[PDB]
Amino acid sequence: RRSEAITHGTPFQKAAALVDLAEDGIGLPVEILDQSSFGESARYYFIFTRLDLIWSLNYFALLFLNFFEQPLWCEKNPKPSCKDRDYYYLGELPYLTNAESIIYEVITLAILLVHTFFPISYEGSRIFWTSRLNLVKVACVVILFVDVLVDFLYPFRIAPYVRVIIFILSIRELRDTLVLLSGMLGTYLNILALWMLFLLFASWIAFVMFEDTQQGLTVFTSYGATLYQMFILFTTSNNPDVWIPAYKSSRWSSVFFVLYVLIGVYFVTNLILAVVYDSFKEQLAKQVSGMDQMKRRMLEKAFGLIDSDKNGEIDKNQCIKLFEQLTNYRTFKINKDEFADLCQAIALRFQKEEVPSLSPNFGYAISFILIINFIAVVVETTLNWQVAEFVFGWIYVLEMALKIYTYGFENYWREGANRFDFLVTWVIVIGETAGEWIRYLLLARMLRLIRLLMNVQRYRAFIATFITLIPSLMPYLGTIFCVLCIYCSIGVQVFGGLVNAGNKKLFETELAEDDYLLFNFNDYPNGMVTLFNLLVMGNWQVWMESYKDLTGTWWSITYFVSFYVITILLLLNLVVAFVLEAFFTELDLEEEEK
Amino acid sequence: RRSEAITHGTPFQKAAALVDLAEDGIGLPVEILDQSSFGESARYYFIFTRLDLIWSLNYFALLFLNFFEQPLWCEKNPKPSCKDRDYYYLGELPYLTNAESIIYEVITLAILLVHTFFPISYEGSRIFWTSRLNLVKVACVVILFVDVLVDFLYPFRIAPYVRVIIFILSIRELRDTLVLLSGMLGTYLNILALWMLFLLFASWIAFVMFEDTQQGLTVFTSYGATLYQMFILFTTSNNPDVWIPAYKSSRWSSVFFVLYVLIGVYFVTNLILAVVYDSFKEQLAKQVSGMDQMKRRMLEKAFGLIDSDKNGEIDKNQCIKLFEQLTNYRTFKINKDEFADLCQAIALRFQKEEVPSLSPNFGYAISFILIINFIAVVVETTLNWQVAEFVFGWIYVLEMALKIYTYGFENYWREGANRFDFLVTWVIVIGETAGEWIRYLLLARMLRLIRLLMNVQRYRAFIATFITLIPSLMPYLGTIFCVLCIYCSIGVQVFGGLVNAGNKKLFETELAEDDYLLFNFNDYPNGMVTLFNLLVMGNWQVWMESYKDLTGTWWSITYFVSFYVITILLLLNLVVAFVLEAFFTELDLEEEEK
């Protein structure tokens, strides 16, 4: 997909390059694809996209700035100060001073303004100002500009939310995931209405059944208390503890809670999963269709470049000339559809990527060396030798240099395996800063051995699906990560500074009894790890009840309830659906192979 | 589906009856179907199957006997005796005396012998002794006969296991579910091998990484301790608690446990579910194919009762004579396959089942009366009237009597709704022994109102799937119940009497700290409720660690590990797969309908 060919080529070379771009799945913007003589501006798109590493690093730096900012509750002069990290159970990360914050923010905002406005070089100005995405992005950058200025001039701060929104808007797969999710919301709110109806009715039966009992006097003291406890019991996280008083009062009480948990878990939760799975499949099919439409648009523009006369047909001589300008670098009458089909048949079967400009047993040799390295490592840990780990590190950098010599980097880097092996080998060699942690990097290379279980048919599908999932779950896990970043910023804004060694109420909260005091919202990394504990649903109601006690209001539970409803019942059920569909796709592939 | 017609009919009536049986799915045993004459052999099968209510009650009574037997540890003279139920945290169910046990066992064994040998009246004796199922059943009855005699004559008792086996063998749906499961076992053991490999490698990294740390000195003290703790962490049930010492020592320690839990839950557990789902689908398809083959065998014998000429074809006169024997009672040449196809088409395109021998607004009227009953109940609980509950109970028995008059019972009882409404109305009217508990029975009748949400398209599929799942999950939930019964019997045999008020070690045991002492294995109902808590996976490691401490051996954990592997990773993943496939089938049905 040579930028040279799209820019300068003879039209048959532009057509071959558009064909290759399309089948590689990396299309040009339609604003370029449609502008007739698009080569005059595609030059700018290519130079723009060559810098993608710099832009991505800017957006990751902008997102990570949230982890190093001082909590706003520390600014309003606590006694003692947040220098007494032990008093506030704070983390280890540094908090930026004002000078460092200004420098960081100025640099990242400058690169963000450059990235956001450079598209005006190839999208026409009238197209730029009419893209919805550009207008939202410009709104975000102007909010960050205001928030930078409003303290460079020296209730809450808006910046940390806008940084996450900009991050979402900057990665195509996150935008796609949020578009997908927006189609699922409507159907999800219906089953949520039925789930609420289930909780409300079950909690009313429970309440009136236990009204004068010890369960009533000690647990189900009111309808709202019953509904709260029954909601937590839907998660099973309080399972026996909540109804022990009934079981002490009558062993027959267990029948109610058995029925309730059996129906709630094995029927309602699984049906919520099934609804999320149906909706996911429908929206993914809509996405795939849209990408196939874009692919056709590109192939049709290539046909419009070979057609120099607008008669909507191509002849033998134009066809063979295109066939040479295709087969020489990238791999009778015809029409638009015949051309698109005939082209896609090459990708279907004949297509192999050619090597860009500038032995089988070797894999077995390195497999032997790395398995010897693994046995040497284990016999070292059991103490049954730095020269071995050194010679292995040397052999791994030799393998990397040999590959990049014999294949060339633009070929080498294409493989998902070796592009990892390269990074970890580089980290290994740059770790020679003159610690034992290089043991774990060496085993991070050793994990490549697991691919050999794909040679064993009883393991081939499982391992192959796992390898496929490692990259392909990244948009979904990244969306969950962005939801956590937003919930973290909210939590630190509303709960920061309540968990402190002088609080006195704290030492009654259950957070103290379970020794969870480091899992607090006083700090951004603290909040992130706490939100991971909540996402795991393990002992999760401890935090909810403790912060209810520390804030003194029931409204605090809205945070934890909404977090549960968004993350568990939706996004993780999405991850389940995605993994199941991936496995079944791998089986359908092998059923075509076998 | 008329016993009279098969037994005594003119051959065209036998053929019509075999057709109708086949389309209801009542496969006559092939020893009859292959008999070459549906003679007295068929008569005995019908009289045998008329008693199915007595046989089912006998098998349920035989299974339930386990709940009322004295624990064998009570027999070996404890000090104090099991009369001090408080000292042993025992349940409320009575324990049968020896006399009552003998009477119960003699009655149930007599009916079991009658049921097991009566098939020799219609199966030939030469077939009876060559059916594998009969031989296994006869082995179980001879084991129970031995175990009855050996204590009527007056280490462990075998009877409670054989009772569960007999129960499984007596219900066709349970035999089906177990033969289904036997095809899934082979594939399940491979992913278990990979799951063990994952645990072993992760626990070795964890062990060597923390070796000299507080996490090492206090939690990961040895490789076996690390593996045990990392296995529990795979369940998430100890999630933060197990790695707090690392997080106190370095906040960066969280990265390891985050990665571990993320991969374990979101990759490996979902891939296990996916593998179980693929295997379930393949085995269910094999089952359906077998039932369709039996249906064809029946229709082929119906054809063979017409074509005594061995034409391979039925003529017009034979065809129309059959057509009246079919369509006057139960709803050119045709070959054997044309006959089977035509019949299976008629089962769709014309058949509405006729009424057996011997208004639309009424549904709205009773819906109004029962919704008024609901509002009258709620305004009674808030005390905003026994005559209301009386008049409503009267109207419900009136509706039942009117239905069974106007439809006839053999027609009435066929509906899954009204067959429940009948039972609960009967329990209501026999409950008029004068208690307020009838409130919940009227509410149970009121639950039928939820079917009206099927009139709302946004709710139809979910509600309809739920209604379909209520009966169709019974084979699977019953299989889980039988596994629980076997594990309960084992647990009571190995752990009974350890949880007692004089144990002294018990009060260190965490079982005593969480107040779980009523959740013990001293008794069969106690064990069943405990195993339900384990199946729910809430705080489940409490019992495992507690019984490790109380028995003083690591071998005790084998019980809990194997229970987890069998019930949670397999059978509940089967329930998930079944619910998902049910929902998707309901959507496919509606998309075929709309």
| Separation in Å, CA of A22 to nearest CA in chain B | 32
User: What is the C-alpha separation between B485 and A399, in angstroms, rounded?
Assistant: 59
User: What is the C-alpha separation between A343 and A346, in angstroms, rounded?
Assistant: 6
Breaks (C-N over 2.5 A) in chain A follow: 154, 331, 358, 384, 434
As a 3-state breakdown, chain A gives helix, strand, coil percent values, each rounded to 5, of: 75, 0, 25
Give the best residue of A194, A214, A220, A381 to mutate against chain B (max B CB count within 10 A). A194
User: What is the C-alpha separation between B483 and B477, in angstroms, rounded?
Assistant: 10
DSSP for residue A34 = T
Residues in chain A: 594
Helix (H) or strand (E) segment spanning residue B335:
strand B334-335
Torsion of CA B255, B261, B266, B272, to 10 degrees: 140
Give alpha helix (H) positions in B328-360: 336-349
- Beta-carbon contacts of residue B312 (< 8 Å; ≥ 6 apart): B335, B336
- Which residues, in sequence order, are bridge partners of residue B314? B334
DSSP for residue B570 = I
Are A54 and A111 contacting, i.e. CB atoms less than 8 angstroms apart? yes
Residue A554: exposure state from Cβ atoms within 10 A (0-12, 13-18, ≥19) = exposed
User: What is the C-alpha separation between B131 and B315, in angstroms, rounded?
Assistant: 39
Residue A51: exposure state from Cβ atoms within 10 A (0-12, 13-18, ≥19) = middle
On the CB side of B63, how many CA atoms lie within 13 Å of its CA?
21
Q: Is A266 on the interface with B (CB under 8 A)?
A: yes
CB contact under 8 Å between B278 and A583, yes or no, is yes
Q: Which of B190, B462, B514 sits opposite A458 (nearest CB)?
A: B190
User: What is the C-alpha separation between B351 and B343, in angstroms, rounded?
Assistant: 10
Are B246 and B253 contacting, i.e. CB atoms less than 8 angstroms apart? yes
Show the domains of chain B with their CATH numbers: 3-178 (no CATH), 188-284 (1.10.287.70), 361-455 (no CATH), 471-593 (no CATH)
Are A488 and A187 contacting, i.e. CB atoms less than 8 angstroms apart? no
Are B424 and B392 contacting, i.e. CB atoms less than 8 angstroms apart? no
Q: E-strand spans in B414-527? A: none
Helix (H) or strand (E) segment spanning residue B73:
helix B72-75
- Beta-carbon contacts of residue A91 (< 8 Å; ≥ 6 apart): A85, A523, A525, A526, B251
Give the best residue of B226, B255, B267, B438 to mutate against chain A (max A CB count within 10 A). B267
- Which residues, in sequence order, are bridge partners of residue A314? A334
Are B362 and B322 contacting, i.e. CB atoms less than 8 angstroms apart? no
If phi over 0 gives left and psi between -120 and 50 gives alpha, with beta otherwise, what is residue A497? left
User: What is the C-alpha separation between B520 and B517, in angstroms, rounded?
Assistant: 6
Q: Is A334 helix (H, G, I), strand (E, B) or coil?
A: strand
| Separation in Å, CA of B478 to nearest CA in chain A | 13
Q: Is the peptide bond before B240 cis (omega within 30 degrees of 0)?
A: no
Q: Any long-range contacts for A24-33 (C-beta under 8 Å, 24+ apart)?
A: A25/A291, A25/A295, A26/A1, A27/A294, A27/A295, A27/A297, A27/A298, A28/A298, A29/A122, A29/A123, A30/A294, A30/A297, A31/A122, A31/A123, A31/A124, A31/A127, A32/A122, A32/A123, A33/A297, A33/A298, A33/A301
Q: Helix (H) and strand (E) counts for chain A? A: 29, 0
Closest CA to A96 of A107, A105, A85: A105
- Which pair of structure tokens corresponds to residue B266? 């979101």
- Beta-carbon contacts of residue B135 (< 8 Å; ≥ 6 apart): B129
Query: Hey, how many other C-beta atoms are within 10 angstroms of the C-beta on B351?
Result: 16
Q: Is B259 on the interface with A (CB under 8 A)?
A: no
User: Of chain B residues 164-223, which have a CB less than 8 A from chain A?
Assistant: 190-191, 194, 205, 208-209
**Cα angle vertex B578, ends B573, B582, to 5°?**
150
Q: Is B552 on the interface with A (CB under 8 A)?
A: no
Q: Is A314 helix (H, G, I), strand (E, B) or coil?
A: strand
Query: Residue written as tokens 């937003």?
Result: A486
Q: Which of B209, B514, B536 sits opposite A236 (nearest CB)?
A: B536
User: What is the C-alpha separation between A164 and A140, in angstroms, rounded?
Assistant: 10
Residue B419: exposure state from Cβ atoms within 10 A (0-12, 13-18, ≥19) = exposed
Query: Residue written as tokens 């076992």?
Result: B185
- Beta-carbon contacts of residue A25 (< 8 Å; ≥ 6 apart): A291, A295
Query: Residue written as tokens 């070797």?
Result: A362
User: What is the C-alpha separation between A334 and A356, in angstroms, rounded?
Assistant: 30
Are A327 and A17 contacting, i.e. CB atoms less than 8 angstroms apart? no
CB contact under 8 Å between B277 and A580, yes or no, is yes
Q: Any long-range contacts for A190-194 (C-beta under 8 Å, 24+ apart)?
A: A190/B458, A190/B459, A191/A271, A191/A272, A191/A275, A191/B462, A192/A565, A192/A569, A194/B453, A194/B459, A194/B462, A194/B463
Q: Is B314 helix (H, G, I), strand (E, B) or coil?
A: strand
Are B355 and B411 contacting, i.e. CB atoms less than 8 angstroms apart? yes
Query: Hey, how many other C-beta atoms are within 10 angstroms of the C-beta on B69?
Result: 21
User: Of chain A residues 458-477, which have a CB less than 8 A from chain B?
Assistant: 458-459, 462, 465-466, 469, 473, 477
DSSP for residue B456 = S
Closest CA to B9 of B296, B295, B305, B297: B305
Query: Hey, how many other C-beta atoms are within 10 angstroms of the C-beta on A143?
Result: 17
| Separation in Å, CA of A466 to nearest CA in chain B | 7
User: What is the C-alpha separation between B458 and A274, in angstroms, rounded?
Assistant: 15
- Which pair of structure tokens corresponds to residue B579? 């619910």
Chain A residues inside the 8 Å CB shell of B212 = none
User: What is the C-alpha separation between B115 and B277, in angstroms, rounded?
Assistant: 37
- Which pair of structure tokens corresponds to residue B281? 């689908």
Beta carbon pairs, A and B, within 8 Å: 161
Are B233 and B260 contacting, i.e. CB atoms less than 8 angstroms apart? yes
Residues in chain B: 594
CB contact under 8 Å between A466 and B271, yes or no, is yes
Closest CA to B262 of A448, A484, A562, A437: A484
User: What is the C-alpha separation between A322 and A306, in angstroms, rounded?
Assistant: 8
Closest chain A residue to B187 measured between Cα atoms? A458
User: What is the C-alpha separation between B138 and B144, in angstroms, rounded?
Assistant: 10
Q: Is B395 on the interface with A (CB under 8 A)?
A: no
User: Of chain B residues 112-171, which have a CB less than 8 A from chain A?
Assistant: none
Angstrom CA distances, A203 to A235, B161, B375, B471, stand at 14, 38, 17, 25
- Beta-carbon contacts of residue A79 (< 8 Å; ≥ 6 apart): none
- Which pair of structure tokens corresponds to residue B487? 């594990």
CB contact under 8 Å between A583 and B239, yes or no, is no
Q: Any long-range contacts for A151-156 (C-beta under 8 Å, 24+ apart)?
A: A151/A98, A151/A102, A152/A102, A154/A98, A156/A72, A156/A493
User: What is the C-alpha separation between A142 and A149, in angstroms, rounded?
Assistant: 10
- Which residues, in sequence order, are bridge partners of residue B313? B335
Q: Is B78 helix (H, G, I), strand (E, B) or coil?
A: coil
DSSP for residue B94 = P
**Cα angle vertex A372, ends A367, A373, to 5°?**
95
Q: Is B579 on the interface with A (CB under 8 A)?
A: yes
User: What is the C-alpha separation between A277 and A576, in angstroms, rounded?
Assistant: 8
Query: Hey, how many other C-beta atoms are within 10 angstroms of the C-beta on B41?
Result: 18
Q: Which of B205, B459, B576 sits opposite A270 (nearest CB)?
A: B576
- Which residues, in sequence order, are bridge partners of residue B334? B314
CB contact under 8 Å between B266 and A579, yes or no, is yes
- Classify each residue of A86-98 as buried b or exposed e, where b means 16 or more C-beta atoms within 10 Å of its C-beta: eebbbbeeebbee
Helix (H) or strand (E) segment spanning residue B313:
strand B313-314
Are B542 and B514 contacting, i.e. CB atoms less than 8 angstroms apart? yes
Q: Is B266 on the interface with A (CB under 8 A)?
A: yes
Q: Which of B247, B378, B459 sits opposite A518 (nearest CB)?
A: B247
Angstrom CA distances, B261 to A532, A533, B223, stand at 10, 10, 19
Query: Residue written as tokens 């046909």?
Result: A303
User: Of chain A residues 530-549, which have a CB less than 8 A from chain B?
Assistant: 532-533, 536-539
User: What is the C-alpha separation between A31 and A21, in angstroms, rounded?
Assistant: 16
| Separation in Å, CA of A156 to nearest CA in chain B | 27
Torsion of CA B368, B372, B373, B375, to 10 degrees: 140
Closest CA to B382 of A570, A211, A20, A547: A211
User: What is the C-alpha separation between B6 and B3, in angstroms, rounded?
Assistant: 5
- Which pair of structure tokens corresponds to residue B171? 């219900």
Q: Is B227 helix (H, G, I), strand (E, B) or coil?
A: helix
User: What is the C-alpha separation between B505 and B499, in angstroms, rounded?
Assistant: 9
Q: Is B270 on the interface with A (CB under 8 A)?
A: yes
- Beta-carbon contacts of residue B130 (< 8 Å; ≥ 6 apart): none
Angstrom CA distances, A588 to A32, A283, A585, A594, B350, stand at 38, 21, 5, 10, 39
| Separation in Å, CA of B299 to nearest CA in chain A | 35
CB contact under 8 Å between A575 and B266, yes or no, is yes
Query: Hey, how many other C-beta atoms are within 10 angstroms of the C-beta on B94?
Result: 10
User: What is the C-alpha separation between B550 and A269, in angstroms, rounded?
Assistant: 36
CB contact under 8 Å between B239 and A208, yes or no, is no
As a 3-state breakdown, chain B gives helix, strand, coil percent values, each rounded to 5, of: 75, 0, 25
DSSP for residue B86 = T
What residue type is A272 in one-letter code? I
Query: Hey, how many other C-beta atoms are within 10 angstroms of the C-beta on B499?
Result: 25
| Separation in Å, CA of B224 to nearest CA in chain A | 15
| Separation in Å, CA of A219 to nearest CA in chain B | 15
